[PDB]
Write a protein that binds this ligand. Sequence first.
Ligand SMILES: OC[C@H]1O[C@@H]2OC[C@H]3O[C@H](O[C@H]4[C@H](O)[C@@H](O)[C@@H](OC[C@H]5O[C@H](O[C@H]1[C@H](O)[C@H]2O)[C@H](O)[C@@H](O)[C@@H]5O)O[C@@H]4CO)[C@H](O)[C@@H](O)[C@@H]3O
Ligand SMILES: [Ca+2]
Length: 442
Amino acid sequence: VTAPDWLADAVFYQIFPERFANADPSLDPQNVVPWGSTPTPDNFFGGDLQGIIDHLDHIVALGANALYLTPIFEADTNHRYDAKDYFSIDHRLGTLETFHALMAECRARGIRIVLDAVLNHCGDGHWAFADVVENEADSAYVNWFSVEGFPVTAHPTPNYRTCSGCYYLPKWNAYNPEVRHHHLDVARYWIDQGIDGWRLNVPYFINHTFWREFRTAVKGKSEDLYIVAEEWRSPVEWLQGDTADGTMNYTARDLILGFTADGGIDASALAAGLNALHAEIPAGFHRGMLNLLGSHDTERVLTRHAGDVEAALLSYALLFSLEGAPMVYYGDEVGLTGDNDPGCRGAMPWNEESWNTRLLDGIRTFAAFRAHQPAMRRGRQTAVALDADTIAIVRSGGDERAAVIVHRGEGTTVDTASIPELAPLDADTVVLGPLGTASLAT
Ligand SMILES: OC[C@H]1O[C@@H]2OC[C@H]3O[C@H](O[C@H]4[C@H](O)[C@@H](O)[C@@H](OC[C@H]5O[C@H](O[C@H]1[C@H](O)[C@H]2O)[C@H](O)[C@@H](O)[C@@H]5O)O[C@@H]4CO)[C@H](O)[C@@H](O)[C@@H]3O
Ligand SMILES: [Ca+2]
C-alpha cells in the first residue's frame, strides 16, 4: 500500500503524559512530588488527561495537529511501558470517560491521536504474569510468557525472557496464538475508543509475521489509521507495504544533529545521508515517516546543542523542511533542557516567564511556512550542499517549489541562479547571516 494521505499535512506533538499538565488533584498519588522536581525512574508528578485537554490551545498555537502519546494504560511505573491491564487507562491519568472527553475535544479541533502499542512485553504486575508467579505450571498463562523454571526469580537476573534484561518487563510469548489474540484485541479496542493510529514500541523484538497480522487488523478498521514503527536504524524493512506506514526517523535525527550540534558532519555529508535515506524509503512512504529531533529516549535538543538556541533553531529549520511529518517533543518548544532518560522527562512549566520565546516563535514560523506552502507538505525532497556549512532542502511538486537554506557558519551569500535546484525560485542572491536560515518559494 502507501501511507495515509493525511500524514502529509500532519504536525505531531509528543507527550509523556505523566509530565505535561496536572489538572486533577484527586488523581494525584500519595507519593506525588512537586511539579518542579527532578525526574527519576521512580517518581510521580501527577500529569493527567484533563491536563492535556486543558492545554490543547498551546499545542494548536505551536502549529501541531496530532499527538503521539507514550503509554497510558494501567501500570506500575511512571513511563508505563510495564502495563498491567491493556484495557484500562492508568488510574492516575483518568478514567475512560475523561479519555473520551479528550478525544471529543481533539476531534472538535482537528487534532489526531496516536497511542503507544507495547506488544513485546508487559509489566511484572500484569494479571497474567502474576498468575504465573503464583500458580506456576498450573497457571493458564504459563505459556503466555517464557519462564525458564520455577519459582519465578527476578534477581540477580531474571529466569524468564524480558525486554533487554529488565526484570519488571517480562516478554510476551507472541508465538502463542492466545497472546496474539490478546494483542490484536488491544489494537482493535483502542481504535474503537476513537484513536487515529498506533506507534509500535520495539517492533524488532517481535517478528514480521505478527506485524503483518497487526496491519491487517488495524487497516480492517480503517485504511486511514496510521501505523508508525519505532526503528533506530534503517527504516526499509518496515516500509514494504505490509507492516508500517512509516518509522520514527532517527536516521535523520542523527544526520541533522551531527551538522547543527556536534560539528562532525558537514553539509556534503548531511546532504549525501539525507538523499541516501530518501532513496532507501519506498515511494508512497516518505510522507509516513515521523521525523523528530528528540524523544522521551534522548537528551533534550537544547542540551544536545549545549544551550545554543540559534544553533538549535537550525535543527528545527531542517526538521520542518523534510518530507514526512515533523514532530516536536513536549517542552522542547519552550527550551527545556535535560540529559537522557530520566533527564528528558521533566515536567512542562506553565509559568511562561521560564519559556524561551525565541525558540517558540522560531518553531512557530517554520511550522507556518510549511503549512502555507503546499510543496513543503507534498513535495518531493532533494538535499543540496552549497559549502561545508550550508545546505539547501528543496521540496518540489511540479511547477512549484520551495526551499529552506540553512547555514551554520558566520554568514554566506547564495547565488540562487547558479544552483540548478534553486534557480526556479527566481530568488537571485540570498544573504544569510551567522546561524541564518532562509525559506523561499516560487
Ligand atoms: O519499552 C522499552 C523501551 O522501548 C523504547 O526504547 C527503546 C530503547 O531501547 C534501548 O533501551 C533498553 C534499555 O537499555 C534496557 O535497560 C531496557 O530499558 C527499559 C526501559 O523501558 C522503557 O523504555 C522504552 C522506551 O521509552 C521506548 O520508546 C522506559 O521508558 C525506560 O525508562 C527504561 O529504561 O530496555 C530498553 C529497550 O530495549 C535503548 O538503549 C534506548 O535508548 C531506547 O530508548
Ligand atoms: Ca493529577
